[PDB]
Amino acid sequence: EFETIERFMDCRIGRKGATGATTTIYAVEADGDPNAGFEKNKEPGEIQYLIKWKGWSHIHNTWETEETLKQQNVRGMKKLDNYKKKDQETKRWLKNASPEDVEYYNCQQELTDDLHKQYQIVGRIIAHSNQKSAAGYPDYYCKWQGLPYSECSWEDGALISKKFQACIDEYFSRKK
Amino acid sequence: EEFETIERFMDCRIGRKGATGATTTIYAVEADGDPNAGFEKNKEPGEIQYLIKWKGWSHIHNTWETEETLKQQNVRGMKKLDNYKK
Amino acid sequence: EEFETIERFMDCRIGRKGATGATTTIYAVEADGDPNAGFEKKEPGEIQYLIKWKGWSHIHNTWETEETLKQQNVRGMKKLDNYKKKDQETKRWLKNASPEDVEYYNCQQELTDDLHKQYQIVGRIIAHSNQKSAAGYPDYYCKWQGLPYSECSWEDGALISKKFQACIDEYFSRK
Numbered sequence: 045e046f047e048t049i050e051r052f053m054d055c056r057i058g059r060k061g062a063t064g065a066t067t068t069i070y071a072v073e074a075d076g077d078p079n080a081g082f083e084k085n086k087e088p089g090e091i092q093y094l095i096k097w098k099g100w101s102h103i104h105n106t107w108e109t110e111e112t113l114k115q116q117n118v119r120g121m122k123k124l125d126n127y128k129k130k131d132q133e134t135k136r137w138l139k140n141a142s143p144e145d146v147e148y149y150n151c152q153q154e155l156t157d158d159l160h161k162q163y164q165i166v167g168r169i170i171a172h173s174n175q176k177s178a179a180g181y182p183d184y185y186c187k188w189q190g191l192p193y194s195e196c197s198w199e200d201g202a203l204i205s206k207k208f209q210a211c212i213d214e215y216f217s218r219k220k
Numbered sequence: 221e222e223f224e225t226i227e228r229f230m231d232c233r234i235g236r237k238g239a240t241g242a243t244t245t246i247y248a249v250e251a252d253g254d255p256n257a258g259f260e261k262n263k264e265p266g267e268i269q270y271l272i273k274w275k276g277w278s279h280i281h282n283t284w285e286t287e288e289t290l291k292q293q294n295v296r297g298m299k300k301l302d303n304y305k306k
Numbered sequence: 307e308e309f310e311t312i313e314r315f316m317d318c319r320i321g322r323k324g325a326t327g328a329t330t331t332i333y334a335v336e337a338d339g340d341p342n343a344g345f346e347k348k349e350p351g352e353i354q355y356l357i358k359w360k361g362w363s364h365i366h367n368t369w370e371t372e373e374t375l376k377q378q379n380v381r382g383m384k385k386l387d388n389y390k391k392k393d394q395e396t397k398r399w400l401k402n403a404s405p406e407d408v409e410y411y412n413c414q415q416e417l418t419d420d421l422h423k424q425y426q427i428v429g430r431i432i433a434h435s436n437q438k439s440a441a442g443y444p445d446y447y448c449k450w451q452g453l454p455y456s457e458c459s460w461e462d463g464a465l466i467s468k469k470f471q472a473c474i475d476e477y478f479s480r481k
């Protein structure tokens with residue numbers, strides 16, 4: 045019925061309207077980053093968030109504003125309050141911080157950042173649909189890098205060939 | 221005629237209606253995909269099927285099968301079906 | 307009217323009848339022992355899950371059964387269905403997977419279960435309370451291994467000092 049929020053993945057200041065379906069990685073690749081030429085300079089922006097939608101997989105992460113979360117009558121809005129609360133607590137005990145703490149925080153906080161971006165490439169395909177679409181695509185059973193095998197999904201076969209045809213090739217070639 | 225025999229009841233399931241038959245042996249499901257694919261009880265194909273292990277065939281031939289479909293094929297040994305139910 | 311709340315399912319296992327509860331947190335078993343110690347079957351089994359609680363840092367992961375989750379009105383049962391299914395489905399698929407596929411599944415599950423085993427290691431204490439306890443222990447704000455900085459948690463100084471004194475120390479040897 046209504047969307048739900050599972051995790052808040054990152055935060056950012058970005059172009060006004062760089063929120064919504066058009067901000068997923070496979071739209072930005074197939075269409076273009078609405079948030080393209082942004083230095084935070086040259087252009088006033090907005091606080092946008094990176095949402096991991098309940099039900100859907102880490103590839104459908106879209107960026108939204110507080111407004112669009114409310115405008116979309118989405119569930120999980122308390123999660124929005126906590127993410128903002130613990131962000132203020134984290135900025136607090138890093139204002140009085142030795143330079144080597146900022147070294148740690150920025151080194152670390154950037155490892156999790158990669159690890160998160162890897163949750164979107166497909167580690168191996170595992171199955172496919174009997175049914176095909178009008179356009180002639182099965183749907184695929186993807187395993188995602190970093191995420192365990194219980195983080196697998198039935199993914200659009202038209203969708204994943206655009207970036208992982210090679211992973212589709214090796215599924216079929218490990219039969220004959 | 222020439223009937224099939226139900227050897228063991230391997231597993232239970234709530235599967236898309238139709239996701240039964242010879243389309244549920246591995247070597248099909250690997251060649252064509254699965255008729256059940258990604259089925260949640262959200263969609264209401266809803267039906268209860270059984271991985272039936274057959275007599276005189278290795279386990280790679282097992283199939284998911286309804287009461288409906290077992291009785292259509294007049295399989296033997298429906299005595300263990302309801303036994304399985306109870 | 308204070309119930310608990312399943313956050314994420316981390317692991318099932320067959321386990322000694324009654325090897326559940328907070329006697330199962332990692333820090334309990336080091337203290338005393340493992341309730342599921344030396345199990346085989348000899349012994350009535352059971353099907354026990356490792357829950358990550360909403361509210362609590364990963365140290366507090368406890369193995370539980372579908373019973374003791376309901377028995378304690380634990381909220382988030384819908385997520386135990388979506389997981390029992392996702393397990394049966396993937397066990398069927400081990401019935402007939404090619405050894406290659408089965409070996410990939412062993413590499414990538416042994417890796418996974420590690421990164422999980424370290425969400426319980428502290429890589430940095432970065433604050434302490436202004437308030438000690440009976441025993442001279444502040445609570446400590448931990449940075450966790452694997453996790454981001456939005457998983458940091460105020461945690462019993464007493465408890466953390468029992469396995470990560472080195473970290474509270476280097477904390478103070480910089481202030």
Ligand SMILES: COc1cc2c(N(C)C3CCN(C(C)=O)CC3)nc(N3CCCCCCCC3)nc2cc1OCCCN1CCCCC1
Nearest residue numbers: 045046047064065066097100104105106108116200202203
């Ligand atoms: C929960 O609602 C939805 C979400 C869907 C979704 N997600 C999860 C994004 C996150 C939330 N979004 C915001 C904030 O703007 C929109 C997009 N992606 C997708 N594709 C998925 C395939 C990838 C191939 C690229 C092209 C397609 C995109 N299909 C979604 C469908 C959703 O149900 C629509 C109602 C029922 N349907 C179901 C099937 C189609 C029509 C009837």
Ligand SMILES: COc1cc2c(N(C)C3CCN(C(C)=O)CC3)nc(N3CCCCCCCC3)nc2cc1OCCCN1CCCCC1
Nearest residue numbers: 308309310326327328329331359362366368370378462465
């Ligand atoms: C059920 O909520 C809780 C949980 C607590 C918890 N966890 C994560 C439980 C472990 C075992 N579980 C089961 C089902 O077996 C579930 C969760 N650990 C801990 N310690 C953490 C401290 C140091 C460690 C050793 C000292 C014991 C352990 N204190 C918990 C406390 C919980 O509330 C009670 C606090 C109430 N407030 C709120 C109102 C105002 C008064 C104070």
Ligand SMILES: [Cl-]
Nearest residue numbers: 190191192421
């Ligand atoms: Cl993970």
Ligand SMILES: [Cl-]
Nearest residue numbers: 156452453454
């Ligand atoms: Cl993480």
